[PDB]
Design a protein around this ligand. Structure first.
Ligand code: 8C7
Lengths: 198, 195
């Protein structure tokens, strides 16, 4: 059930795995980050191996793939957060109940950025006492999306006469999406933690 | 792995199935309600067959059974709600983001149907129709709740991420439980009733 290239956790449910520079797995994340954050420097990249979060996320992905009748439902996005939140996110993922109000709100949910530069703002990846900034790389089930609105506590219906048949996520702009908001647990898998500095 | 007692859905993933009165299943669910709501009038009882919600719930159950190293994590509880919320709950289950929240910002479930039968929860529509779910809830290991909780407290302040599974008003003699995560509750039956 767990991915075959994960480290053997021998009966453990959770591990953070430090990646090596020069491995394709490290370099792809570094390249994705540096595309918009070349003024910052990466300290380390850790692969998050969380068996329970993976299981629940992969069930939601299978369900969305069935429902939407295509496999274009997942995006790899960024999430900047404070040092105090990292232990919780590593273990329990992204909790909308703990989410900050975004400077431009498209709904009351968890925000994920297309560009690492957005998540790199001190407002999100708050520097800790040692000047370390923290950004997740996240598999997000964006699915079918529409432009959000500040009042949303769930994605809006696709059709106002069928209020329970929802968009999967919302965005700031459907033609040029730069942020996505999700409103349900296990719709986002924290896959890598980037620790970085100025 | 859909439950044996579900009825065939012709390759669909969601069905509300009206129960036959006088058959074992209807009688069992009716008895749980009449223990405390014998003065009410039951119009019908529906089995909620929601394959996706069941799947996500059973994954959480298996995880909680592993974490707690036992299978005593599930309780059958009641949830009263308004008619306008019923379609949402049938399809999507319980959402903490959707009354007093004295034990935390989660979804509330009653031990007694009589508590859920209060008009504040099971709001009567035009014709006096009231709605109450019978819910499978992963209460697991619980502690006393308090106002402002967004998740259950930690079991020990020394491991802040190892949480209680739910909170209650009273650990010795609980009358309500609050859960704070999606897919910790499966709406199993919908009772439509009047006072
Ligand atoms: N929807 C329901 O059925 C339900 C709703 C609320 C509930 O307890 C809430 C109160 C909060 C103040 C102290 C006593 C308990 C139990 C069940």
């Amino acid at each position: 059930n767990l991915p075959e290239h994960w480290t053997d956790m021998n009966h453990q449910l959770f591990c953070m795995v430090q990646l090596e520079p020069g491995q394709s797995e490290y370099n792809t994340i570094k390249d994705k980050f540096t595309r918009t954050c070349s003024s910052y420097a990466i300290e380390k990249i850790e692969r998050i191996q969380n068996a329970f979060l993976w299981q629940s996320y992969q069930v939601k992905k299978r369900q969305m793939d069935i429902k939407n009748d295509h496999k274009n439902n997942e995006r790899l996005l960024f999430h900047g957060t404070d040092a105090d939140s990292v232990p919780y996110v590593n273990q329990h993922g992204f909790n909308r109940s703990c989410a900050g109000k975004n400077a431009v709100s498209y709904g009351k949910g968890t925000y994920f950025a297309v560009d690492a530069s957005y998540s790199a703002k001190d407002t999100y990846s708050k520097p800790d006492s040692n000047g370390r900034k923290h950004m997740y790389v996240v598999r997000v089930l964006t699915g079918v999306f529409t432009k959000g609105r500040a009042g949303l506590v769930t994605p809006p219906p696709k059709n106002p006469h069928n209020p329970t048949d929802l968009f999967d996520s919302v965005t700031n702009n459907t033609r040029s999406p730069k942020l996505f908001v999700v409103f349900f647990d296990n719709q986002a898998y924290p896959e890598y933690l980037i620790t970085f500095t100025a």
